Point group: C2
Chain length 85, copies 2
């Protein structure tokens, strides 16, 4: 469980457009290290993790200290927000 | 129906804190004119519109050209985002 931001836009978005939207939001909180992405419409994920097993893109991100989930329509982006501290 | 951003934070937020969070997000898209606010925990709304009838704070905002709804935990903020166009 991490902080979450869910964006629902009336227009359709591409992966690139959604990522730009997500990175723009993340940037208000610090240095946004994008760890993983998932497309809930197509099943696509990055990095290439398949068959291992339940939501592997999320498990991957959480194991790398993900602390902010940003969804933009069908896309979910998992960030580690780094701060100067 | 307008574009929506829903923020779910692990920490508890005050009205002032939630408004600051919302205004900060809105600012990436243009000049954020805050039209109305509602607290879903207490029933509080601004401006002072009561008994008129279903979600009057939302009706008020929509009649003033609200185009972005930002929720921060229990709070909902309705903005008219103005652009230079």
């Amino acid at each position: 469980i991490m902080d979450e931001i869910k964006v629902n836009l009336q227009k359709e978005v591409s992966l690139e457009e959604a990522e730009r939207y997500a990175k723009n939001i993340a940037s208000k909180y610090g240095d946004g290290i994008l760890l993983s992405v998932h497309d809930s419409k197509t099943g696509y994920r990055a990095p290439e993790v398949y068959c291992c097993g339940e939501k592997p893109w999320e498990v991957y991100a959480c194991n790398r200290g993900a602390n902010l989930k940003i969804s933009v329509n069908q896309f979910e982006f998992y960030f580690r927000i780094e701060v100067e501290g």
